[model samples]
Target chain A: PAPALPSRDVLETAGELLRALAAPLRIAIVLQLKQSQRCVHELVDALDVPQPLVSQHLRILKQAGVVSSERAGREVLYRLVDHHLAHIVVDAIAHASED
Target chain B: PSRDVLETAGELLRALAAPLRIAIVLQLKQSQRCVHELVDALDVPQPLVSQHLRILKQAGVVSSERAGREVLYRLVDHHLAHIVVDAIAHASED
Candidate 1:
């Protein structure tokens, strides 16, 4: 028998969310976030890209509800709304690793 | 993790970048399905679903078999598509 699943609208939202993670840098960001929540500076330095680029992508991620942020004193820390969001990146990478 | 793997994974994500396509993956997760059955389940245009299936097959997200007059589609890996199911669960968490 087929297993139970979510409603169509729910699946659509999940798919729309997946599109937000469809970039290489975003994928890398999730891998970092998967390890732990970090400041944008940490993401910037880890990805070895400039601050603006990291900020731009995180902005997209935040709007998609894939990532969220909180102010920690002077700087802010960004993190995935849920670790399951990271699994798409984690599995996508592992899926390709086998190829 | 090599940078190259992330690059390839991005391409794989591109293959799954549509709402309808992801819906198809979730449907296939239930059981392998033929095109018309997907049309019935999703209540969508057949051509659109077929086109998305083309992308899924082209990108290796899904594979198919000739079932006489119809083609049966299924996820390439149950565990791999679990990423999407898990993602759906994550979205529900909100």
Candidate 2:
């Protein structure tokens, strides 16, 4: 039997999913995550963004339930939990690239 | 996938699929919009705003009733509205 989670709105979820990937910072995060999971420090270094900003954005993505984190030793690693979101983001980029 | 919850969320997304409609949500971030105000602010044709408002109203994202010549539209979902505002900002900043 399927577990009963409170009804999550698909439209709202879709919209949040769209909005979550819609940002350049988050987009970069997803792209980096695509290669492999990384910790906050690694993301900060890879994206050239300040640590606080990276964490702030990561917090949003986590809260949106788009990304998942795990404890690896002393550092936490974040990866794309929903691969479907990556597909949508890539598609949108492809669509926009035509112009 | 088949889901009753997903269906409800679809309603919310469909309400926001339009540029003008998203703008309506953006406007409502500050305050409510009557049909006229939305038309003027969004610079969309009056009928378009009305149509968008109808969709938003139907989705229960917004609520409205005739007020003289104006139909005042206010957001019904405060938390959901925040999500929308975040989305708009995301799209905008991108």
Candidate 3:
């Protein structure tokens, strides 16, 4: 069900999250991470983008609290902070592709 | 999904990635609203509200129809409303 009217602060935060995921690479990264945690290199390979660009998008996601990371030796594994965000991204993809 | 699909999704998100636009979506969730009603409720200028409505319309997030002298706007789909509302709730929790 839909929640009540959100406060300005909450809307602003949500907007930030939306903006962070506004890029194609970020959306791809989020979807890729939906199944399993992946490191920066893995994401770069999967998205067929450069390592720096992937990291840039990852930084944006991290700042928005949409993603969390952990150090695995020298590599950092990144994953969605919660399934709610995954659902948001998935729903957005579905919404956009609809006729 | 393909890259095109992701980009299209990004377009929808870009349309909604503004505080005012999000506010407008929330307002429309309850019922369809005219331009003047939105301006009064949002306490913003009519032009600004109309501009955001145009953006939402272009993104297919909302639709409008004439109600006498006013153009009433409403969400294009319930799924989009749920997405916006759920995101707000998630943001509020953290």
Candidate 4:
């Protein structure tokens, strides 16, 4: 009936993906990425956090396979792999706002 | 929104933050399931699944109902499943 239950690796990967996203700044970064792709310092500007901290969490997100990067001449650009990933965070925000 | 929103979302995500729990959420998306049946569908052991299910239940990610003869567990939020679905696709959506 349903697609055979996800593979072990698939579930593991998803777990890692969720854990990577289970952070305040990471969620904020995801919100910004949903708006537009940006470089590390750009994320710092949008998040009003330090550049080094943004880079740290960016590396974590990148390592977790949630976001990918490409060289955009002077600075590298970061973007979500799938926009669908953004919904989970947004939905969580909505849920949290609930009584 | 307030900064607390992210922390709350973090708690929610942390609740669904395991492989078995994610699968449990996905499996329960279509219909409610009792513990044993969920164990069968997941092909994982009962103890582990139940343990994860307890975590989710306590976190309020799922709720139980007395649907007559069946006291089944289903997602607290219908959209909760989709987020898990998105995660499934995200893992391999490339």
Question: Top model by DockQ, which number?
Answer: 4
List ranges where model 1 is wrong by over 4 Å: A1-8, B67-70
What fraction of native interface contacts does model 3 preserve?
A: 0.68
Tens-digit per-residue lDDT, B6-82, candidate 4: 89888898888788888788878878888878878888888888788778888889888887887789899866787
Worst 10 residues of 3 chain B by lDDT: B78-87
Query: Residue-wise lDDT of candidate 3 within A1-99, one digit each (tens)?
Result: 333546789889888878887888888888888899999888978888899898888999998888999998988899898877887778888898884
What value does the lDDT take at residue A43 in candidate 4? 86
Residue B72 lDDT, candidate 4, scale 0-100: 89
Query: Residue A2 lDDT in model 4?
Result: 32
Docking level of model 3:
medium
TM-score per candidate, chains pooled? 0.87, 0.50, 0.90, 0.90
Model 2 regions lying over 4 Å from their true place: A1-8, B1-46, B49-94
- Please give, for every candidate in the order listed, the TM-score of chain B alone compared with the true chain B: 0.87, 0.79, 0.90, 0.88
Which 10-residue span in candidate 2 chain A carries the lowest summed lDDT? A1-10
Worst 10 residues of 4 chain A by lDDT: A1-10
lDDT of 4 by residue, A1-99 (tens): 334678888888888888999999999999999999898888888789999899899899989877899998888899998788899898888887883
How many clashing pairs in candidate 4? 0
